Each structure stands twice: as C-alpha cells, then as structure tokens.
Design an enzyme around this catalytic site. Structure first.
Site, PDB file in Angstrom:
ATOM      1  N   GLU A 132      26.896  91.562 -12.755  1.00 41.67           N
ATOM      2  CA  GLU A 132      25.732  92.438 -12.709  1.00 41.67           C
ATOM      3  C   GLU A 132      25.973  93.900 -13.070  1.00 41.67           C
ATOM      4  O   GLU A 132      25.585  94.793 -12.311  1.00 41.67           O
ATOM      5  CB  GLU A 132      25.099  92.364 -11.322  1.00 41.67           C
ATOM      6  CG  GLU A 132      24.826  90.965 -10.849  1.00 41.67           C
ATOM      7  CD  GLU A 132      24.247  90.930  -9.458  1.00 41.67           C
ATOM      8  OE1 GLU A 132      24.180  91.975  -8.790  1.00 41.67           O
ATOM      9  OE2 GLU A 132      23.838  89.849  -9.031  1.00 41.67           O
ATOM     10  N   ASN A 173      28.954  88.143 -16.117  1.00 40.20           N
ATOM     11  CA  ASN A 173      27.828  87.420 -15.531  1.00 40.20           C
ATOM     12  C   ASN A 173      26.702  88.353 -15.141  1.00 40.20           C
ATOM     13  O   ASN A 173      26.946  89.499 -14.759  1.00 40.20           O
ATOM     14  CB  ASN A 173      28.356  86.662 -14.307  1.00 40.20           C
ATOM     15  CG  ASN A 173      27.346  85.726 -13.694  1.00 40.20           C
ATOM     16  OD1 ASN A 173      26.857  84.808 -14.342  1.00 40.20           O
ATOM     17  ND2 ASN A 173      27.077  85.915 -12.411  1.00 40.20           N
ATOM     18  N   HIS A 210      18.328  82.751 -11.818  1.00 35.86           N
ATOM     19  CA  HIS A 210      17.676  82.582 -10.526  1.00 35.86           C
ATOM     20  C   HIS A 210      16.205  82.735 -10.903  1.00 35.86           C
ATOM     21  O   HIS A 210      15.722  83.848 -11.132  1.00 35.86           O
ATOM     22  CB  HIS A 210      18.140  83.657  -9.547  1.00 35.86           C
ATOM     23  CG  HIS A 210      19.525  83.423  -9.010  1.00 35.86           C
ATOM     24  ND1 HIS A 210      19.819  82.385  -8.154  1.00 35.86           N
ATOM     25  CD2 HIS A 210      20.683  84.089  -9.208  1.00 35.86           C
ATOM     26  CE1 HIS A 210      21.102  82.419  -7.844  1.00 35.86           C
ATOM     27  NE2 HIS A 210      21.651  83.448  -8.472  1.00 35.86           N
ATOM     28  N   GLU A 238      24.304  80.311 -11.975  1.00 40.24           N
ATOM     29  CA  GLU A 238      23.785  80.289 -10.599  1.00 40.24           C
ATOM     30  C   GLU A 238      22.344  79.809 -10.527  1.00 40.24           C
ATOM     31  O   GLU A 238      21.486  80.470  -9.936  1.00 40.24           O
ATOM     32  CB  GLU A 238      23.869  81.696 -10.012  1.00 40.24           C
ATOM     33  CG  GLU A 238      25.227  82.331 -10.174  1.00 40.24           C
ATOM     34  CD  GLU A 238      25.289  83.737  -9.650  1.00 40.24           C
ATOM     35  OE1 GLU A 238      24.342  84.182  -8.980  1.00 40.24           O
ATOM     36  OE2 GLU A 238      26.298  84.413  -9.912  1.00 40.24           O
ATOM     37  N   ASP A 240      18.847  78.072  -9.693  1.00 36.99           N
ATOM     38  CA  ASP A 240      17.939  77.687  -8.620  1.00 36.99           C
ATOM     39  C   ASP A 240      16.530  78.088  -9.076  1.00 36.99           C
ATOM     40  O   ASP A 240      16.358  79.091  -9.772  1.00 36.99           O
ATOM     41  CB  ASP A 240      18.328  78.233  -7.232  1.00 36.99           C
ATOM     42  CG  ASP A 240      18.503  79.729  -7.190  1.00 36.99           C
ATOM     43  OD1 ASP A 240      17.854  80.463  -7.961  1.00 36.99           O
ATOM     44  OD2 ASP A 240      19.293  80.176  -6.336  1.00 36.99           O
TER      45      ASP A 240
HETATM   46  O1  LIG Z   1      29.210  87.905   4.336  1.00 35.75           O
HETATM   47  C1  LIG Z   1      27.837  87.543   4.160  1.00 35.75           C
HETATM   48  C2  LIG Z   1      27.573  86.925   2.753  1.00 35.75           C
HETATM   49  O2  LIG Z   1      28.518  85.892   2.524  1.00 35.75           O
HETATM   50  C3  LIG Z   1      26.128  86.337   2.712  1.00 35.75           C
HETATM   51  O3  LIG Z   1      25.454  86.537   1.491  1.00 35.75           O
HETATM   52  C4  LIG Z   1      25.803  85.943   0.222  1.00 35.75           C
HETATM   53  C5  LIG Z   1      25.379  86.910  -0.880  1.00 35.75           C
HETATM   54  O4  LIG Z   1      25.688  86.385  -2.177  1.00 35.75           O
HETATM   55  C6  LIG Z   1      25.078  85.139  -2.462  1.00 35.75           C
HETATM   56  O5  LIG Z   1      25.534  84.757  -3.703  1.00 35.75           O
HETATM   57  C7  LIG Z   1      25.146  85.716  -4.676  1.00 35.75           C
HETATM   58  C8  LIG Z   1      23.722  85.421  -5.135  1.00 35.75           C
HETATM   59  O6  LIG Z   1      23.249  86.599  -5.844  1.00 35.75           O
HETATM   60  C9  LIG Z   1      23.917  86.789  -7.063  1.00 35.75           C
HETATM   61  O7  LIG Z   1      23.525  88.042  -7.544  1.00 35.75           O
HETATM   62  C10 LIG Z   1      25.434  86.774  -6.863  1.00 35.75           C
HETATM   63  O8  LIG Z   1      26.082  86.655  -8.144  1.00 35.75           O
HETATM   64  C11 LIG Z   1      25.985  85.679  -5.956  1.00 35.75           C
HETATM   65  O9  LIG Z   1      27.353  85.972  -5.654  1.00 35.75           O
HETATM   66  C12 LIG Z   1      25.418  84.097  -1.440  1.00 35.75           C
HETATM   67  O10 LIG Z   1      24.680  82.930  -1.748  1.00 35.75           O
HETATM   68  C13 LIG Z   1      25.065  84.602  -0.030  1.00 35.75           C
HETATM   69  O11 LIG Z   1      25.460  83.616   0.905  1.00 35.75           O
HETATM   70  O12 LIG Z   1      25.345  87.042   3.687  1.00 35.75           O
HETATM   71  C14 LIG Z   1      25.600  88.472   3.679  1.00 35.75           C
HETATM   72  C15 LIG Z   1      26.943  88.771   4.350  1.00 35.75           C
HETATM   73  O13 LIG Z   1      26.751  89.035   5.739  1.00 35.75           O
HETATM   74  O1  XYS Z   2      19.251  86.260  -9.805  1.00 35.72           O
HETATM   75  C1  XYS Z   2      19.116  86.747  -8.470  1.00 35.72           C
HETATM   76  C2  XYS Z   2      17.699  87.223  -8.303  1.00 35.72           C
HETATM   77  O2  XYS Z   2      17.098  86.769  -7.045  1.00 35.72           O
HETATM   78  C3  XYS Z   2      17.858  88.759  -8.486  1.00 35.72           C
HETATM   79  O3  XYS Z   2      16.544  89.177  -8.529  1.00 35.72           O
HETATM   80  O4  XYS Z   2      18.356  89.260  -7.272  1.00 35.72           O
HETATM   81  C4  XYS Z   2      19.687  88.813  -7.057  1.00 35.72           C
HETATM   82  C5  XYS Z   2      20.065  87.944  -8.267  1.00 35.72           C
HETATM   83  O5  XYS Z   2      21.365  87.509  -8.137  1.00 35.72           O
END
Ligand SMILES: O[C@@H]1[C@@H](O)[C@H](O[C@@H]2CO[C@@H](O[C@@H]3CO[C@@H](O)[C@H](O)[C@H]3O)[C@H](O)[C@H]2O)OC[C@H]1O
Ligand code: XYS
Length: 302
Positions: A132, A173, A210, A238, A240
């Site tokens: 990002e 990414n 996403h 990623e 969803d």
């Molecule tokens: O320690 C805790 C975290 O593990 C948890 O939040 C995670 C935040 O990242 C999520 O994965 C990201 C999704 O968003 C994209 O932008 C990123 O590339 C990904 O890495 C993950 O799914 C969450 O579990 O909670 C917060 C902290 O307390």
């Molecule tokens: O693709 C995800 C989307 O929800 C973005 O808006 O915020 C965090 C990102 O990783």
C-alpha cells in the site's frame, strides 16, 4: 472440506495456485478450517505473523514464533507461501515511524528485510516487499519511508530482497486496483514502468481486490491494465467480496483465468466468521465452515 478442490481445478488451467490465508489460531480453532485449507487451497499467506509489528516489535529484536508456525504448516502440507509483508505504513511499530535520520532508516529497513527473508530463505514463493505505497490519486503515499528516505526506498527494498532471497518473486501489493482507468491503477502502472526501466527488481504486482458487491466484473480489465506495467507476473492477493455472490466470484476467477500474467488468486480467509470483514460474509465458506454457492460456482466455472 469441499470434495472438489478449486485449487486443483485452477492449476489444471496452468495457474500456480488458488490459495487462502492462515495463522496459528485459525489453523487450530477447529477441525474443518485446517481441513478445508489442506483439501481445497494450494497456497497460504500469513494473515498477520510476518508483519513488522509481529516480527520486529523492538529494534533489532525479532519474534518469529507466529511466522514459524504458519510456514511450517504450509511446508508440511505442500502449500506455496506468500510472505506478507516486509514494508508497510500500517501495523508498523512506533520505533520505526519515529526515525528521522535517512541512513538510520535505511539501515533498519535493510536489516528487517534481511532478517525476515533470510529466516525463510527458499521457502517463500513470493514476498509482498512493499504494501500500500500509493495514494488513491496515484501519487506516492507519504509514509515514514517515503518522507524520510524518499522514493529511493522502493529501489532499496527490492534490491535488498532480491539479493537476500533470489528465489522469491518480489511483489508490490495494493488495494483499489480494481478497475482499468482508476487513478490508483494508473499510478501503479506508470510508476512500475519507470522502476522496471530503472532496473528495480519488481517481479510482480499484487492486487488485493477487497470488493463490494457487484464490483467483480470490472476486475478483468483492471488486471489487463496492470499487465501493461511490464512485470513478469501479477496476482489477486487478498480476495473477498461483500455478499460473496457467485457472479462476483466467478467474474473475478475468470478475470485471472483469462489474463496470462495472473499466476494465482489468494482469498483473504476461509470462512466468514474469521473474515476481517465478517459482517459482510465476504468469503467462500460460511459460519459452519461449509462451502457456499460461490465456492461451487467457481468449481463449475473451471
Ligand atoms: O494484532 C491485531 C491484528 O492482527 C488484527 O488485524 C489484522 C489487520 O490486517 C488484516 O489483514 C490486512 C487486510 O488489509 C490489507 O490492507 C492488508 O494488506 C492485510 O494485511 C488482518 O486480516 C487483520 O486480522 O487486529 C488488529 C491488531 O490488534
Ligand atoms: O482492500 C482493503 C479495503 O477494505 C481498503 O479499503 O481498506 C483496507 C484494504 O486493505
């Protein structure tokens, strides 16, 4: 576990993998989750264990119990691994973001990349070296790395990664690279073209993907636009989709299937309850860890 492995079916079309994510908790929270992963997916991305906050909580002091486990599980079960993520402005310890000295930051950056990559040297298919780093308008995000080191951090990160583990695919990414013409997609394409022309070792572009409901159909052209950056490959990293409709999912699977550079797809989670966007039930398996319509739709489209 679903009888038909969509990873097997996807690979049947020459793709490298159709994977998902994981870590200790989800791999052990019940019997179905790890069973699903082993039977229907061929790759794994640690959901949180390889991030900066979880690997180097204190300067020069690493904590690899979480990451070790995820890697060991994948290696033990023949699943490709995508390391995630070496350089990011989020989930970054305050000690890093407080550094004001350029050389100090470069030394820290290199040590983090080197230590984390060296530990799993030769076991990682791909690494999200940078995550990002763009503003929605395509300009470079003013993170501590960008502010302190400047645009040269991009070169530094990739070159370091390249030398530490020449076997891993080096990726950049980002999210919102979901429709051709989008400012962020244009910024990604133009910057990478420049970086590649400069010799920066960027093997692939990862598009998080996403999505909201109905945004599946635009992904194909987005991938087509990213392919013009000139990287060796690209991948949906990623995935969803709110609502998890079969149409949205099949559109996205087809978007990757019909684009030569797209090597694989990684769904951001296995079952809805464990999804970081759980309220939108954005995944392929439901609250009972059972396949949803989209999962079957995907299998039937391949
Ligand atoms: O320690 C805790 C975290 O593990 C948890 O939040 C995670 C935040 O990242 C999520 O994965 C990201 C999704 O968003 C994209 O932008 C990123 O590339 C990904 O890495 C993950 O799914 C969450 O579990 O909670 C917060 C902290 O307390
Ligand atoms: O693709 C995800 C989307 O929800 C973005 O808006 O915020 C965090 C990102 O990783």
């Amino acid at each position: 576990q679903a009888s038909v492995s969509i990873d097997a079916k996807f690979k049947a079309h020459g793709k490298k993998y159709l994977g998902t994510i994981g870590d200790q908790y989800t791999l052990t929270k019940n019997t179905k989750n790890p069973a699903i992963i082993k039977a229907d997916f061929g790759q794994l991305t640690p959901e949180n264990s390889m991030k900066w906050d979880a690997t180097e909580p204190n300067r020069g002091q690493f904590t690899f119990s979480g990451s070790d486990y995820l890697v060991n599980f994948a290696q033990s079960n023949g699943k490709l691994i995508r390391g995630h993520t070496l350089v990011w402005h989020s989930q970054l310890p305050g000690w890093v973001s407080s550094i004001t000295d350029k050389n100090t930051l470069i030394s820290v950056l290199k040590n983090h990349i080197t230590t984390v990559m060296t530990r799993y040297k030769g076991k990682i298919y791909a690494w999200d070296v940078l995550n990002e780093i763009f503003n929605e308008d395509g300009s470079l995000r003013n993170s501590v790395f960008y502010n302190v080191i400047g645009e040269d951090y991009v070169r530094i990160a990739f070159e370091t990664a390249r030398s530490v583990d020449p076997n891993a695919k080096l990726y950049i990414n980002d999210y919102n690279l979901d429709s051709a013409g989008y400012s962020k997609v244009n910024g990604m394409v133009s910057h990478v073209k420049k970086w590649l022309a400069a010799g920066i070792p960027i093997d692939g572009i990862g598009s998080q993907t996403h999505l909201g409901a109905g945004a599946g159909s635009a992904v194909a052209g987005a991938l087509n636009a990213l392919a013009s950056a000139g990287t060796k490959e690209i991948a949906i990293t990623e995935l969803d989709i709110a609502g998890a409709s079969s149409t949205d999912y099949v559109n996205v699977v087809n978007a990757c299937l019909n684009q030569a550079k797209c090597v694989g797809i990684t769904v951001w989670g296995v079952a809805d309850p464990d999804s970081w966007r759980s309220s939108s039930s954005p995944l392929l398996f439901d609250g009972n860890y059972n396949p949803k319509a989209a999962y079957n739709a995907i299998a039937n489209a391949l």
